Every structure is written in structure tokens, then in C-alpha cells.
Amino acid sequence: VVPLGVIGALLATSMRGLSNDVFFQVGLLTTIGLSAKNAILIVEFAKELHEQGKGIVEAAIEACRMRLRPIVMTSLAFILGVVPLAISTGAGSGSQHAIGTGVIGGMVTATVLAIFWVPLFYVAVSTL
Amino acid sequence: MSKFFIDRPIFAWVIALVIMLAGGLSILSLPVNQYPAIAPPAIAVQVSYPG
């Protein structure tokens, strides 16, 4: 699911216009970090709910139902934490613009999309 | 591990305040600049010879 964060990093820096540099690299590293974060925070609940004596398909539904609120909590907290770098202009604002758009575009697509998807990758029945 | 602290909250508050004012006095003793030593080291020899 780290492509499902870096696709939004790519499209955000393309529609913003800022190019690939060292800031884009550290932005894609931190966006795969947060993608791993908000995926494992529900897949561990799915794992323990399955291995406490349930099946794989109902445990994922119960885990995502119980854990949708802290995911969107962390996501909106992060996006309001890193929006003032993207909106600011002034001294040294070019580096802030280079570091902000990539992480906002990575995070919103790691949040709004992967919540459907890490259950589908968890309930792969070859993982038996 | 926890369970040693929910019954003993003053210990936790003291740990919080001591890391706070362990960093808060240490900010006043290190310098501030725009960027670190990003440039490579370079040595220049130089002579002048009039005419």
C-alpha cells in the first residue's frame, strides 16, 4: 500500500509544479512511513480479532468498524499540522513549499483510499 | 512497563517536567544557524606575483 501513498505524492507535486529534489525524497520516505502506520494500526486489530477465535473476514470488518475513528483522527491532525508549511509565503518559503505539498498529497491518498484496501490485502486466503 | 505509574502519578509528572526543563535550559547553550556544514571541505593555496 506504499504505492497508494506515493501516487498522491507524485500527483500533488506534479499539479503543484515543484520538481524532484532531496525534499521530495524525504517526503516520500515519510509518506510511506505514515502509510505503514495507518495500515498496521487496523491490521493488528484484525489480526488479534481473527486469532482470538474468529474468521478472517468478519474480524477485518469489526476491526475497521472499531478503528475508523482514530485513523481519520490521526489523518486530519497530521494534515492540519503540515498545511501551514504549504500555505506560508515569505523568507525560506520555497523549501517549505517543496516539503509540504508532497506529504499532504501522500497522506490524503494513504488515508481516503487504503482503508478499503488493507482489509482486502489482509483477507488474501493464501495467507493461511 | 506501565502499572507502576497509574497508581503513582507524581513520579510520571516529575519525569515529564524533568525532561521538559532538561531540554529547556539546553536550548540556550547550542548555536542556531540556517544550514549545517553542507559544503565539502576545501583548501586553497594562493600566491601573487606583480608584473
Partner: protein, 201 residues
């Protein structure tokens, strides 16, 4: 602070993790002076990209304790005992997996290695002490009495102009669980669309 106050809807509890935010970045200033790293714009850049990653392990534990105090009528002194025994394997996990995205970038050489430093150390020190400040003190100061038992108005209507927020929210969770049920129903186009979006990526 105010967006997580909008989430938590309680002024006596929302400052519980936002007093966890000044105790850590100052603590990262305890690390840099221990390592000779001077204050530059990249350290502040790391902290402002890390405050969103920072309070997450505290908001999940206050969310778990308010969930176990809303669903069950237990006092917070034992609700914290029930909560931290069952979510101990996640708040350390997100910190240990978020440190590892920045540990191998610090060992690289070149002029980009020193610019990868101050983006590594100021995050891994924060997440190394965000996990301990999540496990050592915020269950204690949420467990004393700072979450009083509030029943009757459990947020089903909640009054005021903010009262329809959770009313829309649980409807979105119902749409979300119906959507993920329809997702796990078919699952046939939902792998080829993954292949075409990585091919576009």
C-alpha cells in the same frame, strides 16, 4: 490542538495529549545537544512534519479509554488497566516501524547524507521518546479522575451546532462498513485497478 478538540469534544480531556507535545520536542533538544547537532531550519522542519506523527499514540490511548468508558460504565482507574493491557502492542509498533524509515538514511555519505541527517535524528529521537511518554504518563494522568463518568448524553444528539458531527460520523462508518463488505464480496476488479494504478505510478 483545536482540531483534536473538535474530535474529542471535551476541554478537560483534549489538553491531555497537547500537554504531551511540549514535553517531547524540548526532549529532542536534549538529544541534539547530546550529539552536537546545532539548531537549523531542518530540525524545525522535522518537528513540524513530526507533530502530526507525534500525538497519535496518545490519541489512540485516550480514544481507547473513552471508548471503554462510554461502552462500559467503568471508572477510569481500571478502564486504563483494561485499555493499556490490550493496546500495548500497537503504540510501540507504530513508533518502531516509523523509526525504521529514517534509520538507514543517516548512514549514507555525500553532501546529501548530512542533509539526510537532521531529518533522521530529530524524528527518531521524537518517536523514541513519544512511545515512552505514551506508555509512562498519559495513562496515569488520564486514569486519575481526568475522565469523569458522563452518561445520559452519550453523543447520540449531543445538542448544539456540533451535535450533528458524530451523527454524520457514525453514518459514514455505516457507509464504510457496507462499502468494505461490498469490496470483499466481489474482489475481482479490485486487483486489476491496483495493477493499473501502480502502472500509472
Amino acid at each position: 490542538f483545536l482540531v483534536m478538540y473538535l474530535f474529542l469534544q471535551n476541554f478537560r480531556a483534549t489538553l491531555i495529549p497537547t500537554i504531551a507535545v511540549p514535553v517531547v520536542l524540548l526532549g529532542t533538544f536534549g538529544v541534539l545537544a547530546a550529539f552536537g547537532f546545532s539548531i537549523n531550519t531542518l530540525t524545525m522542519f522535522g518537528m513540524v512534519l513530526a507533530i502530526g506523527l507525534l500525538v497519535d499514540d496518545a490519541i489512540v490511548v485516550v480514544e481507547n479509554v473513552e471508548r471503554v468508558m462510554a461502552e462500559e460504565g467503568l471508572s477510569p482507574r481500571e478502564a486504563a488497566r483494561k485499555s493499556m493491557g490490550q493496546i500495548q502492542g500497537a503504540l510501540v509498533g507504530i513508533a518502531m516501524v516509523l523509526s525504521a524509515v529514517f534509520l538507514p538514511m543517516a548512514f549514507f555519505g555525500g553532501s546529501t547524507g548530512v542533509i539526510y541527517r537532521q531529518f533522521s535524528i530529530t524524528i527518531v529521537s521524537a518517536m523514541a521518546l513519544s512511545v515512552i511518554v505514551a506508555l509512562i504518563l498519559t495513562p496515569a494522568l488520564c486514569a486519575t479522575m481526568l475522565k469523569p463518568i458522563e452518561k445520559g448524553d452519550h453523543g447520540e444528539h449531543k445538542g448544539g451546532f456540533f451535535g450533528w458531527f458524530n451523527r454524520m460520523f457514525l453514518s459514514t462508518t455505516h457507509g464504510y462498513e457496507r462499502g468494505v463488505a461490498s469490496i470483499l464480496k466481489h474482489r475481482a476488479p479490485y486487483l486489476l485497478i491496483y495493477v493499473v494504478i501502480v502502472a500509472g505510478m
